[PDB]
Write a protein that binds this ligand. Structure first.
Ligand SMILES: CC(=O)c1ccc(N2CCN(C(=O)c3ccc4c(c3)OCO4)CC2)cc1
Ligand SMILES: CC(=O)c1ccc(N2CCN(C(=O)c3ccc4c(c3)OCO4)CC2)cc1
Ligand SMILES: *Cc1c(COP(=O)(O)O)cnc(C)c1O
Ligand SMILES: *Cc1c(COP(=O)(O)O)cnc(C)c1O
Lengths: 429, 429
C-alpha cells in the first residue's frame, strides 16, 4: 500500500487511541520504518527521519530494531512460537520470572503474565480481592487511591483513574465507586499523609488495597511527588491491614532514574504491575507480581486458585524478547545513562521557564515536562516539532518527552529544542 | 535452564491459568519446541513429540512455525517493530483492517485493535454504552446474555460469564449485575426464543446490548446450539432497540466450519470481537469491529471519541503476522479442509458413544467433544493421552479437541484414538 492508500483505509476503518471515526482534526502521519531512536515518517509524500521523543508511548527504551532484541525474537521463533500455558511450562517464562523476582522490590516472589497493562491491573485487584476472601473478610473489596492517577482502560482500571482526567462524568452509574484522596502534592507535607491516613481509617474494613503510581503519575498529568509519601503509604497500609499495590507500568525499568520507582523510597508493595517497557517495545506483555503470603492465602482459599488465565499467558516470543531487553538493561551502567539523560533534559528545558505561556518545567529521570498555561493545539504542535526533526505528541497543557535510553546527548538536546519551540508557539496563538 | 531447573523455577515463581502457587496436583510439563501440529515435551527427561490436539487453546490454526507466518514476522521485524498508534498509522494496521472489514459479516466497517480477547470484550461493551449515551439514553447500560457463556477474565467480561462456570458465588457484591436467560438449547425450539424476547422486553430500557458466543460456547461447556437462535436474536434486538454483540474470539477464522460462526445464521451483529486465532497463534492480538452507525454515534457523542487506547494498539509485528495468517487461510480451500476435519473427528469419536461413562459425542467443524457422566481426572487423563502421543487437556466432564487445520487424516485418527481411550479410562474407575 502507498502512503495515500494507507491514509484512505485508515480514515474509513481504523480507530486510534481515544479517537473518533470521521471527526479527526488531523490525519495521522504514516510511519514506514523505525530504527534506533528514529522514525521514518511520510511528510508531504516524502520520507523524513525524526526522533521518537515519546519512546512510542514509553515502550522503546532501547530504541527500535536493536540487534540483541531482534535476534532474541528470531532465535525463539526458530524453536517455539507459542504453547498454551495451561499444563505446560517453558524456558522463556522461567527465565523471565526468575529475572523479575530478582530485580523487583524485595518480597515479590510470584509472577502472573498477561498481555497488557490494563489486564495486569485487573489481575492485581483480583489478587487483592481473593486474598481477603481467603482471610474470611469479603467485605474488603473496595480500592483507595489518590487523585491524578491512571491505571488503564478496562472498567475496573477505569474506576481508580482520576475522576476528572478520566471523564468519570460520562460513566455515571457504571463504574465501581472507589475511595479518592486528594491530589498528592509535589513537595513532602506530613499533613497530607496524616489526612490520607484519617480517610483510610474510615474505610479500612471495606478496603482491599491502596493502588498508586509510585513517584511519577503518567497519563493523568505527568506529575511527580516526593518518594517519602510511598514510605508513609507502606506504613499506613501495614498498620490498617490494607494491601499496597504499585502500578509501575509506566515507571518500570529505569525510567525515573531508579530501576523501579518504588526503589526511590526503598518500599516493597504487596502487589506490583509492570508492562510498557517490559519487552523493550516490541510486543505486548505485562506482569503482576505478588508476595508469597498473598499467593499462599489465595491458593488456600475457597477457589484454591487465582481465577484468571489469558489465552496468550506467558507467550514464548514476548517472554524471550523481554528476557533479552531486561538483560540488556542490567548488563550496562543504566543508572549513569539515565542520570546523563536527565541532566540533558534539565539543561535543554531550562530556557522554557522564561516563556510567557509556561507555568512549570520539571524533570525526573528520563522524563521531561513543560507545563503550559493553556491546552496545546496538536494541529500546530505536531508539525512544528516535525519541522524540527522530532516526533512529539502533547497532551492537554503538557509538552513532554520520555526519550529512548540510547539517545545521544546531541539527540536529547534536539528533542528539548523542539519542545521549547513548541512551547514558544503555544504562547503565540 | 535445564528442564529440571525450569520446573524448579516454575513451581516457586510462576502462576498458570486458573492455578495455585504451591498446591498444584501435578507439575506442568516442560515444552521445548513446537513445529506444525506437534509439540516437543519433556517426559522421563527425554524430548517426545506429541500432537497439539488443543491447538494451544484455539490459537494454532495453521500449526506452529508455519514458514509463511515465520516469514511475515521476520520481514516486518526488519522494517518496524512498533510505533505508537496515537497520531501515527502504518501499513500492517491498514492491511489488516481492510482484510477484516472485507471478510467479516456485512456492515462491520470499523476496527479497534487491542491486545487480548478480554480487552476486546470490554471495548465492545464500552462501544455499546457510549452509543446509547450518544443517543441520550444513559439508562441503557446493562448487558443480557444466555447462560453457558464465557467472555474473558477482566471484571466486566466476568459479569456476563456463566454464573456457575465463572464462580460468581466467590464474587458476591463485586460484579455488575447482568441479565441472564436460561441455557440456550442444542436443538431449535421457537419457545426458547419467545421466552428470551419476553425477558429482554421487560429490561429493554436498561439494556445496552445482548452479548453471546455464536453457535459454539467454548470455556463454559463446549456446547453447540442451532444457528437459527442467532437469527432470532438479531430480530429481537432490532425490534427492541438493543445492540447485538457477537463474541467470536474462539469461533472465528473457520473453526466452526464457516469463516465466522455468524455466517451459519446469515446474520450480522452490530459489534463483533475476534482474537485467539487472529495471529495464527504467534502473538497476542484482538479486534473489536462495529458498524458505521455505532462508530458515528459514538463520535458525535459528548466524549467525541471512544474512550479507550491500549499501549500496544495495532502493533506492527502482531498485525503483520495476522495479515499473513488470514491470507494463508483465505488462499486455500479452507471450507473443504474443515469439512474433512469434521468428518475425521466424527469417524474417530463414534465408538465412544458405546462407552459406559459417555453421555454425548458431538462435532462442529474442527471441534470434537466427548461428554462424560463424571469429572475427568487430569492426573490420569493427561499421561494416558501423552502415552499415546497426544497433548489433551480435559476440563470438568469433557474430553475434547480443536486440532490445527493442517492435521492429516492419520493425525486426526491418532488424536481421536487417544480421546476414546481417555473416555474408556473414565468409565473404568
Ligand atoms: C491458555 C490456557 O492454557 C488456558 C486458558 C484458560 C483456561 N481455563 C480453564 C479454566 N476455565 C474455567 O474454569 C472457567 C472460568 C470462567 C468461566 C468458565 C470456565 O465458564 C464460564 O466462565 C476456563 C479458563 C485453561 C487453559
Ligand atoms: C498508544 C498511544 O499512542 C496512546 C495511548 C493512550 C493515549 N492516551 C491519551 C488520552 N488519555 C486520556 O484521555 C486519559 C484517559 C483516562 C485518564 C487520563 C487520561 O488521566 C486519568 O485517567 C490518556 C491515554 C494516547 C496515545
Ligand atoms: C499505560 C498504563 C496502563 C495501561 O496499560 P495498557 O497496556 O495500555 O493496557 C496502566 N497503568 C499505567 C500506570 C500506565 O501508564
Ligand atoms: C478465550 C476467550 C476470551 C478471552 O480472551 P483472552 O485473550 O483470554 O483475554 C473471550 N471470549 C471468548 C469467547 C473466548 O473464547
Amino acid at each position: 500500500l502507498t502512503p495515500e492508500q494507507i491514509i484512505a483505509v485508515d480514515g474509513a476503518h481504523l480507530w486510534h487511541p481515544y479517537s473518533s471515526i470521521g471527526r479527526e482534526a488531523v490525519s495521522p502521519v504514516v510511519a514506514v520504518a523505525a530504527h534506533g531512536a528514529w522514525l521514518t515518517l511520510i511528510r508531504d509524500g516524502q520520507p523524513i527521519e525524526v526522533l521518537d521523543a515519546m519512546s512510542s508511548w514509553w515502550t522503546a527504551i532501547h530504541g527500535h530494531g536493536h540487534p540483541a532484541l531482534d535476534q532474541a525474537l528470531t532465535t525463539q521463533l526458530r524453536v517455539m512460537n507459542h504453547v498454551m500455558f495451561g499444563g505446560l511450562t517453558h524456558e522463556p517464562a522461567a527465565r523471565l520470572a526468575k529475572l523479575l523476582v530478582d530485580i523487583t522490590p524485595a518480597g515479590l516472589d510470584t509472577v502472573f503474565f498477561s498481555d497488557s497493562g490494563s489486564v495486569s491491573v485487573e489481575v492485581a485487584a483480583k489478587m487483592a480481592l481473593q486474598y481477603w476472601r481467603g482471610r474470611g473478610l469479603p467485605g474488603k473489596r473496595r480500592l483507595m487511591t489518590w487523585r491524578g492517577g491512571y491505571h488503564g482502560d478496562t472498567f475496573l482500571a477505569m474506576s481508580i483513574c482520576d475522576p476528572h482526567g478520566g471523564m468519570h462524568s460520562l460513566w455515571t452509574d457504571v463504574l465501581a465507586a472507589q475511595v479518592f484522596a486528594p491530589q498528592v502534592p509535589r513537595d513532602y507535607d506530613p499533613a497530607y499523609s496524616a489526612a490520607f491516613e484519617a480517610q483510610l481509617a474510615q474505610h479500612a474494613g471495606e478496603l482491599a488495597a491502596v493502588v498508586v503510581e509510585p513517584v511519577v503519575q503518567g497519563a493523568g498529568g505527568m506529575r511527580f511527588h516526593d518518594p517519602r509519601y510511598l514510605h508513609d503509604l507502606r506504613d499506613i497500609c501495614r498498620r490498617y491491614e490494607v494491601l499496597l499495590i504499585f502500578d509501575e507500568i509506566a515507571t518500570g525499568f529505569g525510567r525515573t532514574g531508579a530501576l523501579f520507582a518504588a526503589d526511590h523510597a526503598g518500599v516493597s508493595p504487596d502487589i506490583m504491575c509492570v508492562g510498557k517497557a517490559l519487552t523493550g517495545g516490541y510486543l505486548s506483555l505485562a506482569a503482576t507480581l505478588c508476595t508469597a503470603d498473598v499467593a499462599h492465602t489465595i491458593s488456600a482459599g475457597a477457589a484454591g486458585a487465582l481465577m484468571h488465565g489469558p489465552t496468550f499467558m506467558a507467550n514464548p516470543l514476548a517472554c524471550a524478547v523481554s528476557v533479552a531487553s531486561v538483560e540488556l538493561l542490567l548488563g550496562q551502567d543504566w543508572r549513569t545513562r539515565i542520570t546523563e539523560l536527565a541532566a540533558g533534559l534539565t539543561a535543554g528545558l531550562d530556557t522554557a521557564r522564561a516563556l510567557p505561556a509556561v507555568t512549570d518545567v520539571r524533570v525526573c529521570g528520563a522524563i521531561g515536562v513543560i507545563e503550559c498555561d493553556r491546552p496545546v493545539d496538536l494541529a500546530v504542535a505536531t508539525p512544528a516539532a516535525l519541522d524540527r526533526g522530532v516526533w512529539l505528541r502533547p497532551f492537554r497543557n503538557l509538552v513532554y518527552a520520555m526519550p529512548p535510553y540510547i539517545c545521544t546527548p546531541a539527540e536529547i538536546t534536539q528533542i528539548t529544542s523542539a519542545m521549547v519551540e513548541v512551547a514558544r508557539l503555544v504562547g503565540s496563538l
